[PDB]
């Protein structure tokens, strides 16, 4: 009891809040053996439109990430690591903050996972084969959390605690990857 | 029980939300035998002031419409139909969407009322007589609902589902009508 | 229980307090397209008579307002807005404080109604027709509240929080209106 | 019972609202024998940043005021009166509205405290001695309430009911005082 | 219980008492801007007939008043105030005893209503329009009370406490009014 | 029960009200075979002192009357009738209103006692004998009621319902009487 | 039980009574080795304004006293004794009535404290040092009681039982003291 | 219960305390039209005998007053007012403190009875007639209270709160009165 | 239970006993490095006045001591030790009876505290600084006990068990101290 | 229940863990108007001694900070802000991260407090006066939390989430401050 009225309260609170929505696409990037980190939630900037925000917090209700790779020239691997930076002070995290070494096979950095600097949301490896399935994709939908910002505009210095990112890393420089991303969020 | 704590929760949610307010006036229009449709909620645009909105939703707590006619030259009829367009995709609805024929006596369009494209909020007929009461008016106050928008500014293409409109239609081209309208709404 | 003895206490308190009475009349005013605001409770001044007060508070038990219009030259509209100024700092409020625009059709000012500067007690529209009923009137009786004063005499600077006023506004300069008003009040 | 679930609802409502924050500093002012009134909450203007607001209401969760005086030339007194103007119609209140006379020893104005125009939040007197402690300071943190605004920008005419101010008054023209102030507030 | 047998006793008492009846008509009087007061119950005189009385008391079971006005020359107002004089010492009350000023818009005299010299039974305003409804009427039926007399015959000096009267007052000298009146009363 | 808390409420109400006090003396009047009526409560006039009143009502908590006669020339009778005029419309009542005939032996007027115009509070007859006790006196203390006034000053026209009077009447013109009177009253 | 409804009655009685307010300031007095007694409540005189009274009683709800000393020429002591004179017959009490000897160190007069002629409300000693804190102040707020008056105006002969005073006494003639005082009081 | 053991405690306390006794006689005084006030309890002075006291308090258990008048030359009235001065500061009260005017018929002074400066214990009027009973007397015995003193000896300046007095006043200068008085009192 | 009626008995016993009062002042003494002992209760001598006693016992209900020091020439310390001599046989105790050594820092004498010859009521150290606060004071109020005497007059040989004293000791011969003292006591 | 065995488990866990201890001192620093941030927990480095750590976490059981200022040349203010950096990624935080502006009066940075980058443990302001107390100090002891490290040695890059720091800022460059600090911590 009492815990089940509580989540009827939650439902009621939510019918009262606008569920804003922000969508992004990022097509035709080369695979990277040293890795890159891509912004996801950074693109929600201060303003009055449906895919903007008031102040420096939003709360993601759910968000969805779609990754895709295509082998070019050689069969190859594409890894995508969807993560939340719980402690971001206005940066795009480096590969070496997240992975122990800059290698597509690397396990996580032991120091930064120990202190929970990051939370891994999903870690996806696609092996695209020029003698097999040369194109692969994966869509992942998850509930979200609080996201704090450190500024108004879509620049690194605006990222803050709870920022959402995706790390891409693979074993070739020559294949191509696409991603897209949507967050549904309240902003009250 | 439980249903009465629920609406104490609702009251509590509401003390936490700003009740924004938007007021509009539209004076000195000619009676129309073919009808017109006037925007009511369209005029709430994106911005930060008390009669604006964040994002593409607001929730009307209550709204109030005031209509008035004056017979000129001939005694005549003024009809006013206050309605919600539940499915608006960025237009001002035509007379023929709402009425079966473009005539002040017409019943509702059977197709669009069947599918509940519109909800009639109030349908008011004033008969102004040059040998009698030549001026009549009516004020109607009602609780409101969700209103979605399709854009930022006060243009037809910004109307969306839940948009509030008023259809005026009468039997003379020569009488004059006034209306005004206020919505009280949360915007969280 | 307990709540029903409480209002037997209230009744007992009231048999012990003098119910003072103040009556006012204001005849033969022209209709106003830009509006006027008339004092109602201001006329209760410091003194010892039955229609005066000790100190700077009284409590209105009930009060009654009577409005009347007569069409002259043209059929026309008379609007009367009986309101309490909850925050008066020693003024007669302007039309634009109460109405969004200075027009007899206007809805309320959104800012000042939001913050509850005023409480509308009754809003009455009389349409007097030179081809119909050219004379109309309405009497409204209501329970009252606390009224604070900012001075001793009957001047604007003596109005204070809870002051009672009436706003008149119409669509012609030429018709005539009358009002009268009585407050019954304790003064303990 | 029921009252303890109610304030679990309140807590839940609050985790859903951004707690915006506005900070201000005001250094190096001369002591004033006739007094001044300083704005505190006025500086929260309409906009989308973390220390701005949507619409004309915010709700202060808590706010904190820090006052400091330094005796110059003569030992002297600094009084600071932190107050809420419950009825502000778009002004900075005068000293004489708050104090019976413009004197650092004065009690409150009897008329305006009677009608509850103002609520005193804290009244602090610092005696700084050039033969003793010549520098004194006090920090006071309190829960807050609703604040209404009458406009968009940081000007007197934007103050409205619930505006927060500080009155400074002392017995010398020559000492210096500092203040700073922070409000934490929701804005839903 | 006990309270419901009590009003079966009352019913039984009443089947034992003659319900006497007195009827009166008063046609074709001019409207009066200074007002008049007309006798209603005065006309029940000592004697043995069905519309007379024994002694100086009767008890009105119910009574009924019918008022009517007709506009002549100008559209105009007729006010009729049906009242009981709780303290009559053998007079017809003046207009100024009942109304604060001798004006058809006046509120009640504050002194005499405070001490409950009079009880207003019904206050009726008819606006008769030479461009509209030029003839209006109203009938009002009410339960009655004790009526004391100060003499035997139908003269002012016979009125006493509980005497029933009607005050007529309007805004023209030229319109005509009619009234009639019936009391049903016991006389045991 | 409930009735005993009620009169604890009454006691509490009374500790909150000033018990004002008015004292009067009236010495050396001749006995009157035709009678006189003397004012008692009339002398409480509008003002701010302890033996004055605000408005037109006071409530007598208790009052006390002291009468005294002395036979001169012949042994004789002095009668004193302390009474409340429940219906006073701004007069000093005549002897014949109270007594059936103007004679010290008369019973009460049947008409005015029937309708309860007056309430006799005490009727005292002193027989002073020049061969016996030639001087007699009586003091009577009683709880009081509401007293309404019809004006501000100490004149007949200010008496109103609940006015307190004393009628003196005897069988000689030549004896002398004294009276004095005190009312304790609230005035809230 | 019953005792908790009783103080809900009290609260209800108080919402019905005007809380009048009287404020006073008394600046720049010399320290006194023989002492002075200053009036506090005396200044509430008969009249109709917010800081006046009807009759000869008021009831102080709360009152507040603020004392301040400044050492001049020599470091010195200022004593302030806030007291109620329970038996005042129209005087300002002497120092020797309150203190056993006219010395700033004296204990209370044994005779007058024994019979409870006075009630000490607060006794405050400030030691102001020209080598230290040369300025000191203290504010004290307390609930109040009944205050009787012996006259209408602000003179000694108007003080009566319950009069509020402050005795100042110190060890130098040369330092300066300030006081101010506010009473909140009902007057029903 | 508990309340009945309490007054068994009281009885036990009293068997342990000496009941001291003081007796006084005051013969052959002239009647006074302007009045006198006579001391009763003043005569108990500090010392060790049975009709003396230790310290400045005694508690009267019961006391008894005997008054007597004799008409000389003219039949006349003698009034005796036995009263306690609850607030005496070392005086014999004047006639005008007790009576509104210095007249044997006067009611009490309204100011000093309002504030309860005095409590009347018994008010006795004897009318002695040279043609009737020319000698009259009355004895009155009552329980007593605390009596405070302001000094050691039998002088006015020793009276204090609770002092017992008798006021004599009549209508002739020429008759003679006697009184005597006994107090039984504890002194622990 | 039973223990709470017991202290209702105590209260009842006390309303029956005179609370005598004795006040003393002792100004302008030099600080003492070897210490002095001052008499407090010794000054209550046999006699009949309010600040005297019957016999050789009194019971102190409460007593109050006020100490004050002023630095002269050098900043310095003043210690004051308020104590009861439980076993006094008719002396003023020496410093060395109370303190282990005659030094302002000394702890208590171990022998005499062990056997409970004395009870320390309060031990107060004031450090007065010629560069700081050069004047300090402390007031201490406490309930009291039995005090026995060994004689009638105010001499050392009259002190007895329960005698109250104050020991003063400091570190300079040159500063000045004041004290005063009041005992409230029964004497039955 | 169950919650009280739980904290008996906690106690048992703790008797099994070494409570390591690290102490630090930092003397003779100049006051800073632009502020500095000092490391506290950084100095616990990897190693095997009692004031070192294994791995990159410790858990502070309690820690204690001692701050001290001394005014030089001018009386001045020293502020010390003891805080935890919940999100440190291997830095010493700047003044502007913590304070809104680099001023000793500044409130907190709104962005970084909103996202809870820091938790303020204690904020202490010492006003040292060259005419008063020129030296002040404060010691504060608190329970602690988890501290993560980003490296082995005592350099900025080793700070991590939960790092403890102290910000010093004042209004002069010339005064001197000292601090010292001890953490008690487990390291299992
Ligand atoms: Ca936000
Ligand atoms: Ca929205
Ligand atoms: Ca009032
Ligand atoms: Ca017509
Ligand atoms: Ca807002
Ligand atoms: Ca100093
Ligand atoms: Ca009859
Ligand atoms: Ca009154
Ligand atoms: Ca009063
Ligand atoms: Ca005694
Ligand atoms: Ca004794
Ligand atoms: Ca570790």
Author numbering:
A (entry chain A), B (entry chain A), C (entry chain A), D (entry chain A), E (entry chain A), F (entry chain A), ...: 8 to 195
Please give me the paper's original passages concerning this structure.
It is an example of a T = 1 capsid and is one of the smallest known viruses with a diameter of only 17 nm. A great deal is known about the virion structure and it was only the third virus to have its structure determined at atomic resolution.
This is a short stem–loop structure with a loop sequence of AXXA, presented in 4-, 5-, or 6-base loops. The VLP reassembled in the presence of B3 crystallised, and its X-ray structure at 2.3 Å resolution was determined. The biggest difference between the B3 VLP structure and previously determined ones is that here the N-terminus is more ordered, permitting the formation of an additional turn at the N-terminus of the helix (residues 8–11 RKSA). This may account for the inability of the CP to self-assemble in the absence of RNA and suggests that the capsomere may be a protein trimer. Some of the RNA binding sites must therefore be unoccupied.
